[PDB]
Amino acid sequence: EEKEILWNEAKAFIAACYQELGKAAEVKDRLADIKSEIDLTGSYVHTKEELEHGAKMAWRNSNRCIGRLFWNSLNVIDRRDVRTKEEVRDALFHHIETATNNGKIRPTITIFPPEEKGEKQVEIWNHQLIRYAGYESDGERIGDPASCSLTAACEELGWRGERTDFDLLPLIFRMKGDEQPVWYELPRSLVIEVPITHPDIEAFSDLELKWYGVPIISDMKLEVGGIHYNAAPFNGWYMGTEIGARNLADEKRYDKLKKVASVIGIAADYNTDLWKDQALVELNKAVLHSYKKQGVSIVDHHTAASQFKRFEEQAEEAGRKLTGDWTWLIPPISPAATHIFHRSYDNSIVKPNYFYQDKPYE
Amino acid sequence: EEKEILWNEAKAFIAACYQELGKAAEVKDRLADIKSEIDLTGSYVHTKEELEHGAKMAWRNSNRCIGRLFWNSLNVIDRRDVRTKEEVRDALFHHIETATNNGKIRPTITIFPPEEKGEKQVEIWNHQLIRYAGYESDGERIGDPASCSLTAACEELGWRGERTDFDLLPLIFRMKGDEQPVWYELPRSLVIEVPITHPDIEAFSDLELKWYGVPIISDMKLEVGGIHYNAAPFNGWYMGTEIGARNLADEKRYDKLKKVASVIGIAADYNTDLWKDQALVELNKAVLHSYKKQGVSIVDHHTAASQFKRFEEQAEEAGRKLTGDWTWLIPPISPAATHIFHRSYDNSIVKPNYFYQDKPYE
Ligand code: HEM
Ligand code: HEM
Ligand SMILES: CNCCN(C)c1cccc(CCc2cc(C)cc(N)n2)n1
Ligand SMILES: CNCCN(C)c1cccc(CCc2cc(C)cc(N)n2)n1
Ligand SMILES: [Cl-]
Ligand SMILES: [Cl-]
């Protein structure tokens, strides 16, 4: 069954990929090569062209992603050659540096060797390559609650956080053959962070808020033509609402709305004053202002939705079916102000794509 | 097939209704009475208790409605006795008066005779009993665009609007046997309206905005135990976002955000300033403030979601499955600030319920 699944996925991907690349005449011979390769080895190896276009198609097929207009300019780094934990570490350091690009963020994916018999070659434990630690002990909450379990797992391995609200977690990953992951502290020179200030309200800096520049998801599986790249971290630039309406605002994250209300000079006592909504708007204005002022890439949700509208138009013009997940495409601030809110989307799963996988901690 | 559908729906409804009312021992005899009644007449007649509880269950089963905590206090008015258009008109005038209750809004439904062989006895053309007219001619848009087709249909029948931005549409409905609906101007003494002002910004009144107090949906079908009450107008009180984030804000409705931005003293030039979000918050604050100041019932979306959370808890405690439509339950302002955003809902259809039906205009 395994090989049959692989071969069927392979035929569908190669046909589609080569058609898009204008190389349809080569499909037959390539498929023959593949079929024999599967027969002999139990798997097959993507050409660099297939891997690159496959990663791009996967992004294009990501139903929940509003940022898909730019799918074809994804920067794909082929690291299927890595064999050592130093090579992996250095490839991850390099991804951060090249994606960050001094603030002019480049959407990038680094692709490590794929699973073989479902056996992972490299297993990345981080949810994002750059993320803050979280702690909870004796009623005291410090840092990002979303990172509590990973933070505890790191501290089991000999790492120790300073217990600031913004401790950078180390990179942590496990190699095939090793029982325990290794961890490496992030060189701070690699990590751009942005202090949050407000364009009009000087007191906003009193909150001492900041966030990191580049979100780099490192725990999803890239699937291309039946091959499972469980380790393939990717990044874009932030949409401001992710920081201002979720990371800093959610009660189960940094939970800052009451403190925001206070610094902007409004009462936080009555639902009918809409103080939470007002605080959310000002926090989200501060986030965009701060990233722009520092020269770090960011997009606001209105511009992002406008770009997504163009992605819809491009899909129809290219004769491709559009798929989307309305519940994730609408922004968490003023969603009815975007065209997304007012239409529906087919939530069908198309491959290549990115998929969740089980955490090795928890 | 018709009678079989009716009989099956009847058995399911009577069993459930009588169980909830603690009258399960009476189910068998009542069902016998019903089965014979269907045999002889082709239909059956609800007792006043069944009709009342059926209307309440229907509201309780309305997946898209955040206001369902109060389903059991719905005020049901049985008008299955009406036969003349004057009786219908007067029943609709009465609904407005009793539901309005001098501003202390009472959720109310008035139930007219049901369809017989799919033949309607009374056909109400209004979408809501109280709504503003809309006009479009030679590039000029006046009033509420959502009412353009109904307004044109009214003016075909001899009505003429003053072409203000807030013309009250007449009541319009058709009786069985008549080819044309009749229309009746609404007595203004029956209609409470609220001028929109802002608690802090005096200039807000310069926009000369207002809205009506009571939303009374009059074009949905109530279905109870296989009986189709196509004419059964119902009302609640508004959630403020319906007025401030949709009716006055949508580009295809009153489209006021640019004018709001100007009166609150902010630029409306850059997406990254989040001027639309800021305008939406202030407009929505003004709406709540204005209804409260005038003593007209209204709920803000935070309080409404808190009530809905209690509805969820009540459902589990009563051993009833909960159904909901996430896409409609989340408010259009700060949805992630509500618990609704962070969970999922089973969107299954349970009867009794309210259903869309074809418009007789358009
Ligand atoms: C260029 C800037 C980008 C922006 C602003 C953006 C924005 C977003 C947002 C807001 C989400 C919603 C998920 C959440 O909030 O937790 C999302 C989902 C997603 N994005 Fe993007 N994205 C971008 C680039 C990328 C890239 C480069 C990839 C991969 C190559 C990608 C793949 C995805 C995937 C797979 C999801 C769904 C994750 C899930 O199911 O939980 N995005 N994106
Ligand atoms: C008491 C105050 C009430 C509030 C604040 C409320 C709020 C809402 C809101 C915001 C919607 C979303 C639909 C839209 O925005 O267009 C809705 C849907 C609905 N409500 Fe309520 N509601 C209330 C009372 C009632 C009552 C009394 C009934 C019937 C007895 C009812 C039946 C429904 C139905 C059937 C829908 C779905 C309509 C559709 O599918 O388009 N509601 N409600
Ligand atoms: C619902 N999403 C769960 C968390 N995961 C797996 C996830 C996956 C993709 C994107 C996100 C949001 C963080 C993010 C990532 C990227 C690549 C870009 C961006 N603007 N924001 N999160
Ligand atoms: C998506 N809804 C389409 C318009 N319809 C049919 C509809 C039906 C029920 C409720 C609404 C919103 C207006 C309304 C009605 C009622 C009874 C209460 C309320 N707060 N708001 N609209
Ligand atoms: Cl994030
Ligand atoms: Cl309305």
Describe the structure.
Two copies of one chain form a homodimer. The longest helix of chain A is centred in the C-terminal third of the chain and has 20 residues. The two termini of chain A are 30 Å apart. In chain A, strand 6 and strand 7 form a beta hairpin. Chain A is globular, with a radius of gyration of 22 Å. In chain A, helix 1 packs antiparallel against helix 2 and helix 6 packs across helix 8. Chain A folds into three domains: 131 residues, Nitric Oxide Synthase, Chain A, domain 1; 103 residues, Nitric Oxide Synthase,Heme Domain, Chain A, domain 2; 89 residues, Alpha-Beta Complex (Bovine Endothelial Nitric Oxide Synthase Heme Domain, Chain: A,domain 3), CATH 3.90.1230.10. By secondary structure, chain A is α+β, with helices and mostly antiparallel strands. Chain A has a four-stranded mixed beta sheet with strand order 1-2-13-10, sandwiched between helices. Chain A has a three-stranded antiparallel beta sheet with strand order 3-6-7, covered by helices on one side. A three-stranded antiparallel beta sheet of chain A has the order 12-11-16. Chains A and B meet through helix 8 and helix 9 of A and helix 8 and helix 9 of B. The complex binds protoporphyrin IX containing FE (2 copies), ligand SKO (2 copies) and chloride ion (2 copies). Chains A, B: Homodimer. Chains A, B: Belongs to the NOS family. Bacterial NOS oxygenase subfamily. Chains A, B: Its cofactor is heme; (6R)-L-erythro-5,6,7,8-tetrahydrobiopterin.
